[PDB]
Amino acid sequence: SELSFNYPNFQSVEDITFQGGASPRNETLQLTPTDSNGIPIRQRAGHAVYSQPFQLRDTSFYTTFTFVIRTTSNSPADGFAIFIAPPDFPVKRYGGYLGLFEPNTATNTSANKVVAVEFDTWVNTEWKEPRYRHIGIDVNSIVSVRVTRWQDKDVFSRSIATAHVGYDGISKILTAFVTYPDGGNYVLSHVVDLAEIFPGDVRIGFSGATGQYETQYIHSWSFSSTSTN
Amino acid sequence: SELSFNYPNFQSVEDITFQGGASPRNETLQLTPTDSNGIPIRQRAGHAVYSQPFQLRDTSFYTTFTFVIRTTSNSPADGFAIFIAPPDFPVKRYGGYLGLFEPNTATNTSANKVVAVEFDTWVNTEWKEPRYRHIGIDVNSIVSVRVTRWQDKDVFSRSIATAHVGYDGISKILTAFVTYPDGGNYVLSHVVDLAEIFPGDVRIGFSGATGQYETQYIHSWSFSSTSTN
Ligand SMILES: CC(=O)N[C@H]1[C@H](O[C@H]2[C@@H](O)[C@@H](CO)O[C@H](O[C@@H]3[C@H](O)[C@@H](O)[C@H](O[C@H]4[C@H](O)[C@@H](O)[C@H](O)O[C@@H]4CO)O[C@@H]3CO)[C@@H]2O)O[C@H](CO)[C@H](O)[C@@H]1O
Ligand SMILES: [Ca+2]
Ligand SMILES: [Ca+2]
Ligand SMILES: [Ca+2]
Ligand SMILES: [Ca+2]
Ligand SMILES: [Cl-]
């Protein structure tokens, strides 16, 4: 279906729903909470989602957002993701589950219905992940189907980074491009038929989780979807 | 292999090779020529190519550029493309061939070694094309493998538009995202193993062709490639 929205900043959150530990703060989407002294709270997850459902049958989309990862140590955890799931998909487990999964089924593709592009700041040994911080595409599992190294210089840059995420509904390909000013560029694509995974309605949004010593902020977001008829 | 470059404008055109009717003009890459009164010269092609070659085995890349199409009538022709080609790739036929193909082999994928993302302003009947202006991915043929409608409002906007083109060398997927300020967004992706097409050196660049009543300009361009090892 056709949907378009544009948030150059979040002084308005008119159509944004906050769940769990996420909240609007300082003109951004703050995905995990901080205490009254600004210290990141451990073991929390949050979602900030566009409130209106849409359909993926015969649809392509383009979305872009800007983000900042704020770290208070060299050992931040756990990251965030942009995700698509049914409209009643709730905030799930904190820590390395990224608010998207729970421990008993995190790696079980038959037990989840969620697709995401993750920005993963903490190497988990509890399941298979690369031995470095990484950006990945997740399809129904915390173990990414496509993963690439995310350079530490970029992770810790303090920069407003840009993501571009697109889905070509003809070729059935999901792509992310991630760029840092005067920094790295990242490209990841994967063939996945989203309409087959999601035959009904979906919502798109963000999920963040701690972890420790980290807060994730969304500064701007726009989206457009169009029919492939 | 690993290569990076950045032209925030083309005040300097150091490391750009011009062929055909392309030239530096007014701090941009002008892909097709104009006479001294500014009138587009019909039936001309031009290339502006980054001079340093790279290899595609075990490689991903990201490139972005801004562009303007100056039309001087309601029936401009023919467009332009960003393309990759092997060494010594010459300027080929003007008109609907876009500087990238010759007539008798333009539709034969066994007779070309060229991959492009084209911005096609003139509907040709000499080969199969959609019946509207379009953006396409071309693999070894002027008949695009993936094509989408390019809205006239964007074609004729005189806006500085943006293209992002990425290649994921693990999944073997080429993707283009094209955006217009306050206009359309476009997404196309295609599975293609570029290292199997191009086993040695390649260069990346732009090819434009007339046609009539059109000039194509590149305003800015950056590129990075990284090993997937
Ligand atoms: C292939 C190509 O690059 N086409 C470009 C086109 O080029 C034509 C133009 O140079 C004319 C000058 O008017 O000469 C040639 O075309 C001839 C006739 O002028 C043209 O009318 C004719 O058109 C036929 C068409 O090709 C068929 O597909 C159709 O079924 O029937 C038509 C009528 O006969 O073709 C002859 C040559 O065979 C050049 O081919 O120029 C335009 C802009 O005007 C644009 O650049 C095209 O990409
Ligand atoms: Ca991960
Ligand atoms: Ca992790
Ligand atoms: Ca075409
Ligand atoms: Ca054409
Ligand atoms: Cl000339």
* Residue A122 β-bridge partners: none
Contact partners, residue B12, CB within 8 Å, separation at least 6:
none
The whole-angstrom distance between B172's CA and the closest CA on chain A is: 8
Pairwise CA distance, residues B187 & A107, whole Å: 30
Pairwise CA distance, residues A136 & B219, whole Å: 32
Task: Classify residue A95 by its DSSP letter.
Answer: G
Contact partners, residue B38, CB within 8 Å, separation at least 6:
none
H helix or E strand, kind and range, residue A211: strand A201-212
- Ligand 1 neighbour B78 (Cβ under 6 A): yes
B7: its two tokens: 């032209």
β B28-30/B201-212 pair status: unpaired
End-to-end Cα spacing for chain A: 11
Pairwise CA distance, residues A6 & A162, whole Å: 15
Resolution, angstroms, 1 dp: 1.4
The structural domains of chain B, ordered by start, are 1-229 (2.60.120.200)
Contact partners, residue A51, CB within 8 Å, separation at least 6:
A15, A16, A17, A203
Contact partners, residue A174, CB within 8 Å, separation at least 6:
A115, A117, A137, A165, A166, A167, A189, A190, A192, A194
Ligand whose nearest atom lies closest to the CA of A122: 3
DSSP sequence for B52-108: S-EE-TTEEEEEEEEEEEEESSSS-EEEEEEEEE-TTPPP--SGGGTTS--GGGTT-
Residues with CB under 5 Å of ion ligand 5 are B 96, 120, 122, 124
User: What three-state secondary structure class fits B177?
Assistant: strand
Write the residue in B61, B171, B177 that is nearest to A146 by C-beta: B171
To 5 degrees, how large is the angle CA A219–CA A91–CA A180? Answer: 30
User: What three-state secondary structure class fits B134?
Assistant: strand
Pick from B126, B127, B146: nearest CA to B135: B146
For residues A42-76, one letter each, b for 16 or more C-beta atoms within 10 angstroms of the residue's C-beta and e for the rest, the string is eebbbbbbbeeebbbeebbbbbbbbbebebeeeeb
Which of ligand 1's atoms lies nearest the C-alpha of B209? 46
Pocket probe mutation, ligand 1, options B122, B126, B127, B134, max atoms within 8 Å of Cβ? B126
DSSP sequence for B3-25: EEEEESSSS--TTEEEEET-EEE
Alpha carbon of residue A24 to chain centroid: 16
Contact B9, B20 (CB under 8 A): no
Contact partners, residue A93, CB within 8 Å, separation at least 6:
A45, A99, A101, A102, A103, A106, A209
Backbone angles phi, psi at A57, to 5 degrees: -65, 130
Alpha carbon of residue B196 to chain centroid: 21
H helix or E strand, kind and range, residue A152: helix A152-155
Contact partners, residue A169, CB within 8 Å, separation at least 6:
A56, A58, A59, A60, A61, A194, A195, A228
Pairwise CA distance, residues B43 & A149, whole Å: 46
3-state helix, strand and coil shares in percent for chain B, rounded to the nearest 5: 5, 50, 45
Is A102 annotated among the ligand-binding residues? no
